[PDB]
Ligand binder design. Structure first.
Ligand code: GAS
Lengths: 228, 215
């Protein structure tokens, strides 16, 4: 039952120090061939390896991050640590720790990245908690005609993340497509669209409800037609 | 400091054999680079596949094999299955550090190709009040999950302003994505034609707004 679970702050101000912990189960850094690695996935990007620390205390680092990175193990408590100073905007990503395994088979060496933790997220924003701005996305001209009509809601400029939107149509607010956040400038931005047949709007009342628990504020916006 | 390259996307069908590659910008990939292979499933789910350059991690399906073909490290999946649709990464070792590739979006056709359903929204009056004008262009029900968003104004291209999201999977296992074009209330009122050019499977699906519409 090999398990890995990372722990961190979540949000951070630029310049501050990051402190990640990787608590694990099903193995020990006392035994040979064992070690843990640190990898991060920058939002909208690929993977970027950070550091490796083995049972014999051999540490390996990312060349460009060297001066800011420091990895260390606590075999006693069964956890590994990672400190990253002068954290800035480029450090917002989700951090993962993975079990490193070493095998020396017939002169041949093998190194693996087998078990991975789900991750912990970090947003290095200087911004203070801000409520979301909600704008109704009514259908413009050109294609106002047609079987069904798609409406929407633009949720803008808020911090930190986590916002839930709920649609309320008087018939069939069926096709609801909620889109992921797109952190523009320290504040996020997402969208949600719902689809209803062209005979249930403006007739039936459609309203999108927005919630930002971090700020507790809630917004109800009615979708009204766009005219001349 | 080398650059590791992998294909961006590959499409295959259940029962087929597909090979993905990993190349080093500094020359040939040898056993000394100890190529690794990992798979990324939606919602931050990573699973290790190949170690050494051809050794499998215990527990991994026997259909994943790894080796060196020419100057590159390869990953073959013999008889691809629909649950194999995911993103694959590869890393190489350069004496004292690891460097990951860009990853490959692999699509195993569990249903017929589906074109994108595009919709372009104009700036709301409430937003225009604040001197900002956001354009929201939603794209849904497309498959394979690879698309390309292009914006314009009066027919000429835009090179500053858009931010498209990475395609998410829907319940129907189809993908969706969203792009935004941010302008000022001024730049919006100084042009008449706006379009969202969406490319999927070679073909283009352009949407458009004209500020002279609605009478
Ligand atoms: N991932 C990874 C990785 C880690 C270490 C190595 N190192 C490597 N040699 C050179 C070096 O340490 O600089 N191979 C190592 C090795 C070094 C450190 C930790 C595990 C293995 C080794 C040790 C003992 C017997 C055979 C091989 C190579 C790849």
């Amino acid at each position: 039952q090999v398990t890995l679970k990372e722990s961190g702050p979540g949000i951070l101000q630029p310049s501050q120090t990051l402190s990640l912990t990787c608590s694990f189960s099903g193995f020990s850094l006392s035994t040979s061939g064992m070690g843990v690695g640190w990898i991060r996935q920058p939002s909208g990007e690929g993977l970027e390896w950070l550091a490796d620390i083995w049972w014999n205390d051999k540490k390996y680092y990312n060349p460009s991050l060297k001066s800011r990175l420091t990895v260390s193990k606590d075999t006693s408590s069964n956890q590994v640590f990672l400190k990253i100073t002068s954290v800035d905007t480029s450090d917002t990503a989700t951090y993962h720790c993975a079990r490193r395994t070493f095998s020396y088979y017939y002169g041949s060496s093998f190194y693996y990245f087998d078990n991975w933790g789900q991750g912990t997220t970090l947003t290095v924003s200087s911004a203070k908690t801000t409520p979301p701005s909600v704008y109704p996305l009514a259908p413009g001209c050109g294609d106002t005609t047609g079987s069904s009509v798609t409406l929407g809601c633009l949720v803008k400029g808020y911090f930190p993340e986590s916002v839930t939107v709920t649609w309320n149509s008087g018939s069939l607010s069926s096709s609801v497509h909620t889109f992921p956040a797109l952190l523009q400038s320290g504040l996020y931005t997402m969208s949600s669209s719902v689809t209803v047949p062209s005979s249930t709007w403006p007739s039936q009342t459609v309203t999108c409800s927005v919630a930002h628990p971090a700020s507790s504020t809630t917004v109800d916006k009615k979708l009204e037609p766009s005219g001349p | 400091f080398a650059v590791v390259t992998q294909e961006s996307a590959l499409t295959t069908s259940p029962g087929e054999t597909v090979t993905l590659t990993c190349r080093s910008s500094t020359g040939a990939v040898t056993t000394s680079n100890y190529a690794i292979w990992v798979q990324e499933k939606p919602d931050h789910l990573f699973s290790g596949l190949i170690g050494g350059t051809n050794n499998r991690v215990p527990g991994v399906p026997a259909r994943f094999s790894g080796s060196l073909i020419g100057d590159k490290a390869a990953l073959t999946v013999t008889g691809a299955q629909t649950e194999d649709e995911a993103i694959y990464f590869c890393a190489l070792w350069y004496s004292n550090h690891w460097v990951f590739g860009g990853g490959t979006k692999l699509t195993v056709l569990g249903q017929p190709k589906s074109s994108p359903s595009v919709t372009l929204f104009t700036p709301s009056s409430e937003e225009l009040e604040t001197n900002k004008a956001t354009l929201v262009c939603t794209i849904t029900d497309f498959y394979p999950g690879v698309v390309t968003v292009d914006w314009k104004v009066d027919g000429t291209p835009v090179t500053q302003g858009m931010e498209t999201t990475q395609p998410s999977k829907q319940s129907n296992n189809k993908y969706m994505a969203s792009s935004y074009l941010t302008l000022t209330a001024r730049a919006w009122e100084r042009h008449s034609s706006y379009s969202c050019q969406v490319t999927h499977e070679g073909h283009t699906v352009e949407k458009s707004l004209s500020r002279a519409e609605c009478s």
